[PDB]
Amino acid sequence: TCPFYKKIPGTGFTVDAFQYGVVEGCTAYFLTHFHSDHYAGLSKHFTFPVYCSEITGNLLKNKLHVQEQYIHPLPLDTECIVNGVKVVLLDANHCPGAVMILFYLPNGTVILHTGDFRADPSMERSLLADQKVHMLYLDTTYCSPEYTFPSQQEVIRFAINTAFEAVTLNPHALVVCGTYSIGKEKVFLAIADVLGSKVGMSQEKYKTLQCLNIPEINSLITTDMCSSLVHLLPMMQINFKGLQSHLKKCGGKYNQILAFRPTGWTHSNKFTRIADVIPQTKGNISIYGIPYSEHSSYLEMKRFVQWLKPQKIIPTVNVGTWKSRSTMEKYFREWKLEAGY
Ligand code: NI
Numbered sequence: 001t002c003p004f005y006k007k008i009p010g011t012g013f014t015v016d017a018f019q020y021g022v023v024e025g026c027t028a029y030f031l032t033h034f035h036s037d038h039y040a041g042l043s044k045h046f047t048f049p050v051y052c053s054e055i056t057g058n059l060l061k062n063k064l065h066v067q068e069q070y071i072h073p074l075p076l077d078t079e080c081i082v083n084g085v086k087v088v089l090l091d092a093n094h095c096p097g098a099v100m101i102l103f104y105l106p107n108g109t110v111i112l113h114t115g116d117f118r119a120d121p122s123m124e125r126s127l128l129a130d131q132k133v134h135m136l137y138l139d140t141t142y143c144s145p146e147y148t149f150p151s152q153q154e155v156i157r158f159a160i161n162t163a164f165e166a167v168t169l170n171p172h173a174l175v176v177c178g179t180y181s182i183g184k185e186k187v188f189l190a191i192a193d194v195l196g197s198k199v200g201m202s203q204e205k206y207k208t209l210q211c212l213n214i215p216e217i218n219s220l221i222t223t224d225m226c227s228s229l230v231h232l233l234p235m236m237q238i239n240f241k242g243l244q245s246h247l248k249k250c251g252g253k254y255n256q257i258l259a260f261r262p263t264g265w266t267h268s269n270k271f272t273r274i275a276d277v278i279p280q281t282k283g284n285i286s287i288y289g290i291p292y293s294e295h296s297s298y299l300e301m302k303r304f305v306q307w308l309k310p311q312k313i314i315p316t317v318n319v320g321t322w323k324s325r326s327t328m329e330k331y332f333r334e335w336k337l338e339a340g341y
Contacts, residue, residue: 005137005314008113010105011085015113015137018042027083032115033098034059035181042066051082053089055097058211059182077127090126092117094294095183096212102127112308113137114316119296119304128308136310140317141295143328147265148298149291150274156190158274159260159290163191166258167229173256175230176246178238182208183294184262189220191260192230200228226253235261240282247285256284262292302335309341 006017012027018041023029031039031052042050044065049072052060057073060066074080076089076099086104094116103111112133167173175195177188192199199221201209206223222228233246238261247257258279268277269291279286296304305313313332318324 003319005316005319008103008111010107010109011103012083013085013103015101016115018046022048030101030113031056031060032092032101032113033095034063035095035116035183038116039064046070051087053097053099055212056099058213059097059208062211063208088127090123090128093120093123094118095181096185096214097182102133109134111135111137112310114139116141116295118294119300121303123304124307133308134311135314136305136308136312137314137316138301138305139295140301140315140328142265142293142298143301143315143318143331145298146270149265149269149293152186152292154274155262155290155292156186158277159187159288160190160194162288163258164194166256167195170256172254173229173258174247174250174254176238176243176257176259177230177232178235178259178261179205179232180235182212184292185209185212185214187260187262187290187292188230188232189214192220192228195229197229198222198224198227199230199232200225201232205232225250229254238287240285240287243285243287257286259285259287261287261289263289264293264295265291302331305332306335306339306341309339 002014002017002020002023006014008015012025013030014023014026015030016032016038017023018029018039028049028051031050034056042060042064044067046066047070049070051072051074054073057071060071061068074089076091080087088102089099092098092100092115098115100115100117101113110131110133114137117139163175175191188199201221203223206221209217209221225231238259243257243259247254266289277288279288315328318328
């Protein structure tokens with residue numbers, strides 16, 4: 001049955017709640033982004049109204065075959081009326097098409113649901129600046145002070161410099177990047193741009209990327225693997241066995257692989273700077289784990305919440321254990337006492 005933290009009080013609405021069958025009293029299902037833990041349950045047989053971004057709606061129609069008549073895409077940064085309630089979609093700084101949702105309830109309560117997000121000071125100047133928020137449904141994925149990670153810009157600088165150096169030393173090296181969902185496209189696109197190559201990939205992955213409104217995409221991606229020296233593979237194939245096998249398939253065009261796994265956080269973060277990251281190597285294969293996150297660090301999350309000053313916080317992640325819940329509630333209280341709200 002649907003958990004309370006997916007239900008918006010005072011409305012007929014749910015958020016990211018497609019795996020529970022017909023939710024009692026739900027008149028409109030919102031979807032914040034196209035990640036499987038959130039869309040799980042949608043298909044061509046879904047016949048209730050789904051409200052989402054334009055990019056999310058392209059993915060629903062083309063990948064899951066949801067019928068057009070039930071997809072209701074909304075423009076960002078625009079006040080819209082849904083079943084008599086004003087809503088606004090805001091950029092979540094997560095993956096392409098990902099949104100946060102502002103609900104303006106009929107009684108005067110204002111609720112922000114962040115979906116999945118990577119908090120940024122740029123958010124302090126959207127439509128959030130303009131009114132008070134009473135309740136915050138918060139992405140608490142990395143809600144503990146051990147979770148530090150560098151900026152996305154520092155991580156992409158490291159990746160570009162590492163790839164450009166390796167291929168300039170050896171023009172017969174192949175670069176491989178792992179993927180299993182949308183998100184993190186900058187990693188493989190930035191590396192292909194520095195190398196003067198397109199990114200090669202499966203037809204299924206090319207189809208997914210063509211749903212994303214990324215400018216000049218026909219210019220950066222391809223299904224012709226033979227013409228590309230940057231290849232995208234499933235994340236599960238980014239290991240020495242999977243990569244050895246891939247290199248066999250390239251028919252002696254290449255004699256070395258440099259591969260990237262963009263993880264979120266890993267405990268090499270608590271000790272090591274980005275500058276200092278080293279690969280795992282076996283023979284002619286090297287694998288870099290790079291801390292490219294599309295979720296808030298602890299300090300980013302803290303700053304956003306101390307800026308917004310909500311009256312009540314409802315965590316949406318890590319809610320399944322009493323130790324996690326108690327930990328998070330203790331940090332929320334600290335933040336409120338330190339800031340004075
Ligand atoms: Ni997500």
